[model samples]
Target: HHWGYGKHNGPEHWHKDFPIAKGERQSPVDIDTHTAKYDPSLKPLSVSYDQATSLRILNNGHAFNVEFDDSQDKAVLKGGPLDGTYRLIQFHFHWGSLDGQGSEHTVDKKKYAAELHLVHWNTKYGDFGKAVQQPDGLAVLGIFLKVGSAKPGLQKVVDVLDSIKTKGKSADFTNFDPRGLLPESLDYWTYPGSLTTPPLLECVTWIVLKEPISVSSEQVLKFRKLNFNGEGEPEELMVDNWRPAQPLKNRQIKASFK
Candidate 1:
């Protein structure tokens, strides 16, 4: 039994496996202006990436991820609610079956075609594994993906999806900048939250961009072609892997722009 976002084992059933599903700080919550407060105190996010550190692409049965070598300061995310630099480790996308609704987090309570998550860990926390378990050690940049003009940067990612269509599959990918996947505006909404997936680690500092990036229907829909099963196991469509928006509880949603 795998932990996934399917009807059989999706978020609704997650609480049974991971008790923290009902925690005080779960992620992917709806971000509305009413619940979000503008905070000029929040710094502008600084993203400097070195594509040379990009390593490979893999299908983790849920989504396609491009990982980087985080051992050095090759790529780092700083400012914007972060006390120190958070080294870039990897980035992944979550989508739906066709083109309906797939984004985990919503702005003004509306879902986008998909979502991109750039995973980072506070340098002060040492490594990703160690940092992921701490409340203030992880920072994830959430970018909403909408269908429109094809994103050249994202097409590079889509081209590699065929190679890792099956679970446990991977291929070499390098010199790819994750910054290319970002929207022009760095304006964002942030809150303390947990990982949307299993282990349900409450470590993520969610910085969700207000503007969305454009992508083609063909490229954005490619996420459905991935297989959740192994090479020979039961084939399951790797779509709709996003978790439902959790209750915001008493957390404050801080906005970085007016």
Candidate 2:
């Protein structure tokens, strides 16, 4: 792999290839709730997903992803910080080697066990490739995953880990509702930011949920069963697949609720 969460090819060195890594709106900024302003106008986020849209899950070397069939936009996210509807292309997770910290966007410097990213691309710009070039091309809904009681919805995803245990391995995964993975509250902190990984495009409107959905610590560990190294390579566990909070720069974070 050309890039990974290793000492040599990690986040700190991404800027060499993706200069936008240091762009003005880079993502995964630590949310200082005290300084975030409440904006009453921010509407409750609207999300609708078709269970049939779920296609398969795969280990992409960087992270394991469950991709959806977005052919007709059957599953999508709207309202809140979005303009028009954004298609749910896929969703992935980021976590630490340990349970103490793993989330990308921290709150007041506090980290969660992991983070879930539902990556959506704007329909206004046609396909995801062209859309990614535009500032408003993407709307990623980030849900922090704290270690606690097991979440049944998440268990479905965790159960499939053994199949895609190595890099590039994939399995057919279907009949899953992504909406079931969201927290009960629609409240969130939104800001203009970029993707947390390489080729960090300054095009995401990051909508991070304030309330995290719970997942048992055991389930979180199952993710580590995945290997960053492929079937025959020197074995390396896929952990700490997250980028620490980046500089906030001139961006202002807005809260949905006061």
Candidate 3:
């Protein structure tokens, strides 16, 4: 039930797939906040794995949730250019049904075909819920994925996709370092924002990378094979499970270089 390009195609048709989909917050705005303000002192705090906490692969039937263990102790966050060291809680991905395009965060209004989210919390201030109440409480790293070239960093996670191919089934992944999936370049764009999900708390500090990693066409297709509703229940394939873009309001989007 994957709908290709057309008037009612892509995430625009999410509401039809799930009634509550329309109520979700989307990311990757046009970023047209024109202001003279800039923070040159801003930099990302250096982070090293203190210990491998926990890795849980959930069986949601649509996609997998690979979570890590963090005591919020080793994670540090410096001020200014460096967003505080936020503890990485979990990381997940979003893809399309057919494989051409599926991610939610768009670049220049262009969808990257697939997207990945590395969710973290600002332990420097408070816990996840309390931090989310402040402007710089939460930080989410977004990496876009395109069809072409194979990225060796993705092989570790991709190898396990086959085990959870069926809806509502998952297996445990252990001793796996999530940082291995990160792209070489850390240069990113930072801005004040909120969660891309419900409650839509506007206390997020978003760090979206400019350079995206590439995955082969075949690898991208593997995600399309996932199911969410149930096994053998064909309503709409869980190909594009991305939230739509949200309003920028009066927020500013700043890049590391300029």
Candidate 4:
């Protein structure tokens, strides 16, 4: 079966096809805030983006994605745990079918309405696809999304979900800034882990932010409206795209803040 978040084809069965699914440094680990060690030397993170460079949005039968033209250093992240520059390639979201549970990473046994992953690759690896094979190649900035006031910034993404509602469907989304999607507090839990999806490469250095941003329940349900089918095919909701948290396996999670 293909890799998906469905009951049978989901994370639980991923190891069957991808051996690394059960690897030691898996991602989306539960962060018990009380236990995470504070790292005083961790420098402040940096985020720079050019609002005029997004290419488009697409539904790749898994999750909705906002792809970028990472041809240069137009959008780059440095500092923090990173030793060099990482280029922003794209960003995607993970959520549940219902509002009760969804986020891939939970804090102190707490889940959110949704979660966002801003995926990047180290320039030292040359290209993003190649970077996925190295231990220090990728960096994913994770942000939790709780139900509360409507996030006007997020509406830019929510507003266009319908255009690319079906798998293979896409729409132009130029001149967009990926930074409008971040929370105020850059304080985060940093860990070494693999990608949450299959081939499940152990390449990402997860930077999970401490503060959660807000998104209305009404807007969250819009994400569920995305379909996994094409014309004349049965509709399958594209919800619960998140994988459950994996074991930390004795890895150290450094907190950039106290």
Candidate 5:
């Protein structure tokens, strides 16, 4: 009924619900690596995680997310474009309808199979609620997923998807560490942008990894089997939950390395 990736209520129509959708800094920009400026001053990104803080995984009717206990700095992301440490709150994914193209942020017009978003809030802002509205409130680490060999780290999440295949369904998911999903290189391209989803607030500092992690084609099919609708309604596949590339406008995209 609300905003979704459907024909009637997709990204193209989000401007009706959220006027800021056409704002100057919308996200999911196609990373034109050729034009991105190399910033030697950029520091390597730092990430720390705690398995104990992982709480549960759920399908929020849009995309499935693994929530963390963010009451304290149990898991954190720092350095790079962030001024201070940011607390990891939740991580989710955006994918295409098929393996040919599903990633949210494309690299030089090339699409990957999927994309992962590790959402964090600036600790200096006190909490996520206050930080989400600030100019430098949120920092999202994006990792593109390619189809190839099986990824042991991703397999853990895939194993549990069947239990929560329906919209709004959830299951206890703990002891899962996110470090396994990270790419070999921390080199990234960063820019100021808004959330790719609805309520498209322009508060995110997007850090997209230059390298990608691998996932099996069979595993991606598991994600596709998920339903956008709940158990009662007619079945609707939860594919193409990604918003298309937005205008870059005047924002400068910076690379951590040459």
Candidate 6:
């Protein structure tokens, strides 16, 4: 049975929708690495942003896809003092069709309205597609979005949401930099996890940002206004496009700070 917002739609009911949910790996669990046993070999070093010189933005009807050129920045991994140069490839978001809520990751069993994923790969892995198949080959940065009176950093993209409201529709968005949307701090919670979607690849190192970006009620509503159909014909509205949360699989989450 398909569930909507409110009591039944919460994470706890995910198993009701998909019985396999009990076996999947979910995200946004509270990060309390200090209490969990951690592997000292997995520490990340301070990375240099010098390589990410340019940001490319794509208006994919469902959401925005941002690509970062590798020639630009070298990410430093600091756990064991290993100097690894990571490159940014592309980033996208997973959301529900409505404005109020549609994200995959949850906080302490609480679901957020939306979530964004910034995908990056290790230069040593060769390319993004190849890295997607290897464990510890990819690092995904996840950020949560909440609805409120506050201004969402996504306004820049929302301002142009009208241009590409239908599926398979796309447009070039210029002069828009994604860096501005990132929270002020790099502090994040890390964990060894898999893709939330199908194929359920187990090759991901997740770094979920603690700070959330806020969006106004209207801006949030704009997303709900989107439709999967093209400009003409019958306007088929796109309601929920998010995948339900996966399972934790006994894995622990590590945070940048206590």
Ordered list by lDDT, greatest first = 5, 2, 4, 1, 3, 6
- The per-candidate count of clashes, in order, stands at 0, 0, 16, 0, 1, 19
- Judged by lDDT, which candidate is best? 5
- TM-scores, all candidates, are 0.97, 0.97, 0.77, 0.97, 0.98, 0.73
Candidate 3 deviates by what RMSD?
A: 4.9
When summed lDDT is taken over every stretch of 10 residues in candidate 1, the lowest stretch is 45-54
lDDT of 6 by residue, 163-247 (tens): 6677666666554455656766666677777665433466677877778777677877776776656677587555565666554
Q: What lDDT score is found at residue 39 in candidate 1? A: 94
Model 3 CA deviation exceeding 4 Å by range:
1-26, 31-38, 45-47, 50-54, 72-83, 98-100, 124-130, 166-168
State in Å the error of residue 163, model 3.
2.6
| Reference-based lDDT, residue 89, model 3 | 72
* Candidate 4 local lDDT, residue 153: 84
Which parts of model 5 have CA positions greater than 4 angstroms off? 50-52
Q: What are the Cα lDDT values of the candidates?
A: 0.88, 0.91, 0.64, 0.89, 0.92, 0.61
Report clash pairs, candidate 2: none
The lDDT, on a scale of 0 to 1, for candidate 5 is 0.92
Question: What's the C-alpha lDDT at position 174 in model 3?
Answer: 77
lDDT by residue (tens digit), candidate 5, 173-221: 9888898888889999999998889889999999999999999988898
Instruction: Please give the lDDT score at residue 202 for candidate 1.
Output: 95
**1-258, model 3: which lDDT tens digit per residue?**
343323465445644654433332334455443442345766653545546454666546445677776554543334434454777777788777655566766666677778888777877766677777776777777888888898776777778877776667667877776666667777667776656544456666677776788888877777766666555676445576765565655666777646
Candidate 6 deviant stretches above 4 angstroms: 1-62, 71-83, 97-100, 150-152, 230-233
Winner on TM-score between 4 and 6 is 4
RMSD of 2: 1.1
Question: On a 0 to 1 TM-score scale, where does candidate 5 land against the true structure?
Answer: 0.98
Model 2 per-residue lDDT tens digits across residues 65-84? 99998777788899997889
Give the residue spans of candidate 2 off by over 4 A.
50-52
* Worst lDDT 10-window in candidate 6: 74-83
